Each structure stands twice: as C-alpha cells, then as structure tokens.
C-alpha cells in the first residue's frame, strides 16, 4: 500500500531529466553547510527537534526596555570606511599580517564590545543560564 506525501518531499526541486549540466557537491564543507541549514529548517515528518528541543512559544518575548539610540547609519558607515581605509593604507600592518606577529589590545576590544553590542551577547548568556525564565517567567 502507498500514501501521498503530506508536504513537499526533499530533493524534488532538482531535475533528473537533466543531470550532467547540474553542479555537484565538490566539497564536504558545502554538503555540511547544506545539511545544517536543512536540519535547522522545519519539516513535516517527525524529527530530533520536536523531541529534544526548550519548546519556545511561537509568540514574541515581551520586553519593554531601553530602546537603542538613533545612530545615523550613513555617517556611521562613513566613519567606519574612513577607519578601515586608513588602516589598509597604513604601512606596517602588511608585514605584520604576512609574518603573523600582530596582536590587538584586549582591553580596548572589550570596552568597544561592551559599548557597541555587548548587551545582546549578555542577553543570550542570561537566557541560556535561565535567569529570564526563572525571574520574569
């Protein structure tokens, strides 16, 4: 006996009438990337995710907090381009990179990180440790 498939079966978008024209997986890493994105995509058949995943609600997570500042993205990217092109125009960074001896100030990196986008990483860490679900339900 047979039954129709509920959802669109995999490997159905490809055409097999034409096979040699098609591009092939020439790298395990390409295949792996495809596989990971497929796995993170949802599916109609039963899968590992709907057994061993927390089953977060589909609705939004309410947070009436401090919104971001209104930063002028145009001049922000302009200053960033000025900075990167000045760095590229600098002269010693070439030898530094091509001899593998350079470094970076950890303190400055930490300060700029916690100023710019630290809070998002800290929110991620908090929701991992379970502070939010336990405090604010």
């Amino acid at each position: 006996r047979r039954t129709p498939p509920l959802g669109p079966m995999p490997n159905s978008d490809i055409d097999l009438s034409n096979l040699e024209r098609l591009e092939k997986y020439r790298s395990f890493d390409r295949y792996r990337r495809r596989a990971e994105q497929e796995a993170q995509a949802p599916h109609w058949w039963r899968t590992y995710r709907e057994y061993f995943g927390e089953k977060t609600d589909p609705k939004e997570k309410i947070d009436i907090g401090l919104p971001p500042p209104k930063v002028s993205r145009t001049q922000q990217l302009l200053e960033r381009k000025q900075a990167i092109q000045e760095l590229r125009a600098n002269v010693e960074e070439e030898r530094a990179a091509r001899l593998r001896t350079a470094s970076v100030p950890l303190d400055a990196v930490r300060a700029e990180w916690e100023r710019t986008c630290g809070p998002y990483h800290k929110q991620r860490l908090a929701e991992y440790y379970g502070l939010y679900r336990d405090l604010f339900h």
Partner: protein, 120 residues
Amino acid sequence: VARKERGWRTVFPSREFWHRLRVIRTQHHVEALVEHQNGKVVVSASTREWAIKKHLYSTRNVVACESIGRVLAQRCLEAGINFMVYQPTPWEAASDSMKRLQSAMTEGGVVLREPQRIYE
C-alpha cells in the same frame, strides 16, 4: 554528573559533549561559536564586529584566526567555560591557522578536552 548524548557513532559530529566550538571561516570573515549540544549558542566571536575589525589588517589571515581565538578564550573563561570540545576535519586540524588558534586558546587557559562523565 549531567548526561551527554552518547551515540551518533555513525555520523561525523559526535554529540557527546556539553560545550562545542564551531569555527566558520568564509572568504570574507571568520567566526567562532561556543554552543551547547542543544544547538543554542552560549557565546560567540566574529571578525564582523567593528571592535575587532578596526584593529586588524585582514579578516581572514592566520592573525585573524589566532586573534579570534584569544578573544574567544577570554570570553570563555569570563563566562566560566573552562572545558569544551572541538570536532575538526583532518585538513581543518592540520591547517596552521586552526592549530595556532587552539594553541592561543590553551595558553589563554582553556583546554579542548572535556572531562569524562562520572556516574560510578
């Protein structure tokens, strides 16, 4: 004492861990993610960030790799993650970039070997 998912011996990623390191280097940038077996990230690092990119010449060289390694080790031993696991391919492990990356991490104070589960 926790249980780690023992099994999957047939498939390449061995999920018998608690905190895994996944490194993705593209032809434009390089990122390193420390996540749980749940597939959910616990901490991240990426050359895409302006704080790290302003100080650097190229986002893809061995210098960038080892710098991301050092920064990620800093973040890890800040977040208490002193032990973690890494499943590289043969060439990915033989590469000098990832070798120097894991060396930087070890000297930063994080070992890429996870303790053996206890239960008697």
